[PDB]
């Protein structure tokens, strides 16, 4: 469950750009 620092997937951000 989201808590603390969330993890953003930069490989996904790149793939979807």
């Amino acid at each position, epitope marked *: 469950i989201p808590n603390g620092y969330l*993890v953003l997937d930069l490989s996904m951000q*790149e793939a979807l750009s």
Partner: antibody, heavy 111, light 113 residues
Framework: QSLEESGGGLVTPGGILTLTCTASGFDISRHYMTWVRQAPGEGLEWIGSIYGGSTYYASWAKGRFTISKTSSTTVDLKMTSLTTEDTATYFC????????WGPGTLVTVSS | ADVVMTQTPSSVSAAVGGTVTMKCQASQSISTALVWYQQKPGQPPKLLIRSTSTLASGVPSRFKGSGSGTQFTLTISDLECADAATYYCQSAALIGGVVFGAFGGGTEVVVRG
């Protein structure tokens, strides 16, 4: 889209060098433009990334390597106090964990 | 300290048609924000898998990525001579304003023809 690194060559130990990554076909501002190097016979190593105005460095590279945007299509990598440990092919990558790579540029630190 | 990706084994071998696996262990949890690269001489590293398990374009299904958190695996089945290469994992996460971008040390795959 394409990427091409430039600026590699022979540099004397103790010297400085600036590499450039030039993009074609896309806006670098929209991506984590990333520098990676590979010493001959060794593994890939993340140096740092730039996303718009934000820069990120590997702890080993902080202070000695600096990344900046130098035009609408270029980012650079400024390297200082070079030694033979910095001899490597340097690549730029569109994205952290991205799929678009330049062919690399070779830096040779030698007297 | 930056995240460290420990990749094992350093080298693995199988016959044509066989299956090999390699592992990437992260020193800090990175959810599924992890990629796998294939590198051969002549061209830069090639993205194989992103977001742990999503095949990149053109990559055949015999490559399979699994795992999460701190443990990740790449499996190559039905090995072909074209799969001889060195494979690297890379963390690819933004966590707390820090880019977790470290590479694993690589696994050389030898294909026995």
């Amino acid at each position: 889209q394409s990427l091409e690194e430039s600026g590699g060559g022979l540099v004397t130990p103790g010297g400085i060098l600036t590499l450039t990554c030039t993009a074609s076909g896309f806006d670098i501002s929209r991506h984590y433009m990333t520098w990676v190097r590979q010493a001959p016979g060794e593994g890939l190593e993340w140096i740092g990334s730039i996303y718009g105005g934000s820069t990120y460095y590997a702890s080993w590279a902080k202070g000695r390597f600096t990344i900046s945007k130098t035009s609408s299509t270029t980012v650079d990598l400024k390297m200082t106090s070079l030694t033979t440990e910095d001899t490597a092919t340097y690549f730029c990558v569109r994205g952290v964990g991205g799929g678009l790579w330049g062919p690399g540029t070779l830096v040779t630190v030698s007297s | 300290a930056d995240v460290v990706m420990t990749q094992t084994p350093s080298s693995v071998s199988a016959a044509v048609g066989g299956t090999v696996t390699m592992k990437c262990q992260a020193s800090q949890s990175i959810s599924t924000a992890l990629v796998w690269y294939q590198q051969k001489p002549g061209q830069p590293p090639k993205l194989l898998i992103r977001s742990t398990s999503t095949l990149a374009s053109g990559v055949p299904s015999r490559f399979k990525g699994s795992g999460s958190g701190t443990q990740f695996t790449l499996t190559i089945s039905d090995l072909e001579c074209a799969d001889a290469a060195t494979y690297y994992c890379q963390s690819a996460a933004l966590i707390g304003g820090v880019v977790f971008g470290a590479f694993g040390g690589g696994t050389e795959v030898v294909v026995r023809g």
